[PDB]
Amino acid sequence: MKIVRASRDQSAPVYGPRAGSQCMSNCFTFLHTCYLMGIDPVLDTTSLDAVLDSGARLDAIADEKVKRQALTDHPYRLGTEIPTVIETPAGITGHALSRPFNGTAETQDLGGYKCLGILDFLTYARGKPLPVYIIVTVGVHTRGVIVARGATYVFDPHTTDLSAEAAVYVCDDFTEAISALSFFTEMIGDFYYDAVLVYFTRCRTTLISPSELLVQIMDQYKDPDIDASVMS
Amino acid sequence: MQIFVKTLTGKTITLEVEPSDTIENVKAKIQDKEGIPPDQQRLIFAGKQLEDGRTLSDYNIQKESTLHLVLRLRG
Ligand SMILES: *NC[C@H](*)CC(=O)OC
Ligand SMILES: [Mg+2]
Ligand SMILES: [Mg+2]
């Protein structure tokens, strides 16, 4: 396992009043940037700092919609509360989220409703056309995960024992990825995750409705795992 | 009538409910007892996620049935 670090973490006072709480938007911005640029350019300190800057902006946008809609008054976010069009210097993406994935360390089949264990989930993801982009939350901490052919990348916008700063953990296997999702310690028994796959498209401009975008992405991928029930 | 609600991490909640109660109402009862906001609750019975505007009776959920509670995590 190798590590590539930003120059700060998400709790830095520069990021605003919501410094700390923008983790999920920082993860979306990470995935967005890798989809557009490829992975290699994003894996340096300058680019990771740019991800954090853009993530703070996205979070601010998400925060206003939550307040306007009265989506909740909780400070932390669900995936469906993040704007599906994301615009940065790298370009513009639209995304659609998968159906929910939830589980513990081990797969549980709830009368036909499969709740995959974390390894089985990453393995499921790896059976799709690579790379696959994932938002994964464990506890209150959201990470971005990219399952690619030769490595699994885990972006963590918060401090770990291995890094003071936000970092991408470059993992040779899922055992290392799961360690990163586990805060590099042993928590087999307490483990529980909430994850969505993120299906991206490059957009020429931002002038597309959320409903138009979802239908377009459904037609692009033709993958039953895309959550259509999001439609409004 | 009594139903059981079990989470993925083992915990079992006992609830007193009526067949004509909506899924939304069941979620409200789970918040009243366990403090979990309804928007973070996914209730599962017979292999399927249950829809808020439907009732227990719509899903043929009867006395002593066990539902599963899958939780969304705010990040
Ligand atoms: N889920 C919000 C981002 C994580 C966080 O606030 O860490 C405390
Ligand atoms: Mg770069
Ligand atoms: Mg009555």
CATH number at residue A220: 3.90.70.120
| SS3 assignment, position B70 | strand
Distance of CA B6 to the CA centre of its chain: 9
Ligand 1 — pocket residues by CB below 6 A? Answer: A 20-21, 23-24, 76, 140-142, 158; B 75
Shortest-distance atom of ligand 1 to CA A75: 2
Shortest-distance atom of ligand 1 to CA A22: 3
- Alpha carbons A28 and A135: distance in angstroms, whole number: 7
Query: A111: closest CA among B61, B33, B30, B11?
Result: B61
Are B55 and B23 within 8 A, CB to CB? yes
Is the preceding peptide bond at A89 cis, omega within 30 degrees of 0?
no
How far B11 CA lies from chain A's nearest CA (Å)?
12
Are A156 and A167 within 8 A, CB to CB? yes
Other CB atoms within 10 A of residue A190 CB: 12
Shortest-distance atom of ligand 1 to CA A137: 1
Type and span of the H or E element at A144: strand A141-147
Token pair belonging to A96 = 């659609």
Query: A24: closest CA among A80, A64, A66, A105?
Result: A80
- Provide φ and ψ at A163, rounded to 5°: -155, 125
Resolved by:
X-ray
The question of whether A53 is a catalytic residue gets the answer no
Token pair belonging to B48 = 């399927």
Q: Provide the residue range defining the domain that includes A144.
A: 2-232
Q: Would you list which residues of chain A are within 8 Å, Cβ to Cβ, of chain B?
A: 23-24, 27, 72, 74, 76-78, 100, 102-104, 108, 110-113, 115, 135, 137-142, 190, 192-194
Cα angle A145-A146-A147, degrees, rounded to a multiple of 5? 120
CB contact under 8 A, A104 and B44: no
Of A72, A104, A135, the CB nearest to B39: A72
Residues 6+ apart with CB under 8 A from B2: B14, B15, B16, B17, B63, B64
How far A104 CA lies from chain B's nearest CA (Å)?
7
Query: B74: closest CA among A144, A74, A52, A187?
Result: A74
Tell me the resolution in Å: 1.8
Task: Mark residue A129 as left, alpha or beta (left: phi above 0; alpha: psi -120 to 50; beta: remaining).
Answer: beta
**What is the number of domains present in chain A?**
1
Type and span of the H or E element at A216: helix A210-221
Interchain contact B72–A (C-beta under 8 A): yes
Instruction: Render A25-92 in DSSP notation, one character per residue.
Output: HHHHHHHHHHHHH-SGGGSSHHHHHHHHHHHHHHHHHHHHHHHHHT--S-SS--GGGS-SEEEETTEE
- Alpha carbons A38 and A227: distance in angstroms, whole number: 25
Q: Which residues of B touch A142 (CB under 8 A)?
A: 75
What is the architecture of the domain spanning B1-75?
Roll (3.10)
Token pair belonging to A197 = 């796959």
Residues 6+ apart with CB under 8 A from A75: A18, A21
